[PDB]
Amino acid sequence: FRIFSRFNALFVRPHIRGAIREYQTQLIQRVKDDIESLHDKFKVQYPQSQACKMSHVRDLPPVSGSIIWAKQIDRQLTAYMKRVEDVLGKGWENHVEGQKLKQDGDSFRMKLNTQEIFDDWARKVQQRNLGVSGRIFTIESTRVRGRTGNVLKLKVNFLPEIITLSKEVRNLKWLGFRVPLAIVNKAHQANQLYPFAISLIESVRTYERTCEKVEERNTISLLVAGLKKEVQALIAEGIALVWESYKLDPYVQRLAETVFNFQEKVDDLLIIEEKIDLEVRSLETCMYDHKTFSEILNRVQKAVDDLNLHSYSNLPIWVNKLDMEIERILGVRLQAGLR
């Protein structure tokens, strides 16, 4: 076909047409073999092919991926038939081989229909009745493994897979397939409300993770209590809200920044607390000498002052109990030295 594309000048003159009609049967047989190979490749189903895997990697949902893949296969088949029509000329179907080839192509195209899967997907979407309306976030009861009590794990009233439906609808609109207007409205609402919901869920996950990190080290929870108090107050303010409102964006923004500040203060307190605990443990076994004790105490007080200037929460009792522990350790070292 490329060789012919090099030379198409006197095809109007029925002199070179004898040569092309001499090999016309070879052309038809080879094109038939090509379309048979393409159909064999098609017979490998979309989920059974790596095309579905890559499209999932390419953010293309499997339903739309299969639909568009069949569409492009049909487009390539149409390109093949129109190119054969162009190269051979008008009325190749008049030949018995030509009409047989066109019948095979039409049968394959009938087997290559695509709207049925679109209708099935739309029917399934309508039947399941996807929705996000309700509460801003949901609280549930779960008995997590390892603990006898019923943990009231906090979740977000938002299905992560709804955006997949929204992107499916977005793809289908330019694909020429029309979905019911209710589905259009639902997908549009989910798409526009997605950033707020994902921000909410990431913020709540981060706050949870850091609060379990805090309670992992019980020596820090008393200091961190105030920040947890404001976080709980913000959660209490936000939970009463219905899923959709006009104050959603400012509330999500302030909650996210509050959670980020809470987490960063948590990690700063954690590192300074491990530092001070390490210094205390070193002083526990420190050799009997007024000097080294004095520098250790000076560094301890410097860390305490660094915490104080940061304007953290609930310091004085923490300082008092640190003094209690350090005076007990001092008494132990003093009895050792005295004996």
Binding site: R2, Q72, R170, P195
Partner: protein
């Protein structure tokens, strides 16, 4: 005889420089100095970090023309193990192990080097959060992460780039939603610019890949899964979509602008690798594609210009073969072709800096790098002139 001092000095992790120099020198010590056309050169397949893993992105370090960054999405083999896998690979000496490794809590979609700093590496993930990592420091966690907010990216990001020089740099990223956002390498916690790209009637563009004219900042060119190519001015006199192209019927997967610069200006030539084996080429001044690539069907992924040759590029097919395409000698058949062994679902390719070799990605994680013919790598003024005259053919 110590029993705890060695134990505690081992427990204490002051091995940053220790491990850094050990890794940089032991692979050198692997050298065996004991006193007693296409052709594969080096095949890389990390068993630990690429076992049944699909490469998500590929890049070449301009500052260090020996370093590569490889990206991976979440691993279906095991969700408990780290999902976002980022690989750093080097050619200082032959070695199976990668030079560096990196992990992101979300599936990594795109990643690239930084032009502003020759060590920092930036990567786009599936959660739409750009990820910063420092190569010099020995850490696995992301160094910096943009906030996940409405102003910032929220949909998965598939193309991140740094524009400008080493003193006027600007990190530009595009989300699949259509948000364009500019950051700086110093701070990655706030978008310097943010604007949701729109073509018309307030509908956004689902951008898949983005490209920019070589040697030019602003006036970006984007590709959409919808099957259309768009020219979008970054700031100009008006931000947003500046041109509607006819495009290709199938989705546009790999879009790239011409990079070779010589006696003629060919920076306006655009090549887009669509889903239908069709690498469509044209110029920004023409609304129609100038030529079409057609040898099979079903998804040639991406098209990448050769930095040295003006009329030569590469494009890898999902079927499992890489064909080298040159315009000066041919316009209907590939000037060179080769298929990776096993016929794997070859994903993506990336032209190295200064050319002379190509890097190929794969869905199995076995990336292959190899050179090209010396008779075909080097261009000449005749190549530029004949490319100019072949562009005038139609």
């Amino acid at each position: 005889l110590t029993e705890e001092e060695k134990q505690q000095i081992l427990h204490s992790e002051e091995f940053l420089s220790f491990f850094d120099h050990s890794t940089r020198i032991v692979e050198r010590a692997l050298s065996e100095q004991i006193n007693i056309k296409l052709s594969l050169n080096r095949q890389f397949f990390d068993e630990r970090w690429s076992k049944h893993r699909v490469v998500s992105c590929l890049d070449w370090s301009s500052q260090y023309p020996e370093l590569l960054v490889a990206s991976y999405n979440n691993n279906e083999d095991a969700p408990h193990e780290p999902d976002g896998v980022a690989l750093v690979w080097n050619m200082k000496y032959k070695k199976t192990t990668p030079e560096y490794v990196f992990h992101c809590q979300s599936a990594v979609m795109s990643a690239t080097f930084a032009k502003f700093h020759p060590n920092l590496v930036v990567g786009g993930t599936y959660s739409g959060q750009i990820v910063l990592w420092d190569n010099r420091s020995n850490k696995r966690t992301p160094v910096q992460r943009t906030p996940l907010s409405a102003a910032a990216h929220t949909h998965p990001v598939y193309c991140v780039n740094v524009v400008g020089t080493q003193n006027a740099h600007n990190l530009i990223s595009i989300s699949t939603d259509g948000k364009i956002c500019s950051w700086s390498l110093d701070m990655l916690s706030h978008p310097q610019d943010s604007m949701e790209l729109v073509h018309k009637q307030s509908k956004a563009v689902a951008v898949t890949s983005m490209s920019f004219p070589v040697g030019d900042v602003n006036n970006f060119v984007v590709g959409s899964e919808e099957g259309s190519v768009y020219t979008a001015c970054r700031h100009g006199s008006k931000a947003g979509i500046s041109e509607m192209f006819e495009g290709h019927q199938g989705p546009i997967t790999g879009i790239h602008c011409h990079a070779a610069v010589g006696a003629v200006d060919f920076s306006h030539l655009f090549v887009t690798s669509s889903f239908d084996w069709t690498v469509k080429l044209w110029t920004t001044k023409n609304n129609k594609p100038l030529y079409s690539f057609e040898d099979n069907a079903d998804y040639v992924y991406d098209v990448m210009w050769s930095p040295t040759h003006p009329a030569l590029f590469a494009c890898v097919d999902g079927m499992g073969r890489l064909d080298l395409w040159n315009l000066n000698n041919d316009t209907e058949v590939p000037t060179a072709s080769i298929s990776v062994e096993g016929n794997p679902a070859l994903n993506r390719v990336r032209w190295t800096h200064s050319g002379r070799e190509i890097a190929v990605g794969d869905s199995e994680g076995q990336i292959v790098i190899y050179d090209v013919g010396e008779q075909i790598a080097v261009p000449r003024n005749d190549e530029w002139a004949r490319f100019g005259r072949t562009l005038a053919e139609i």
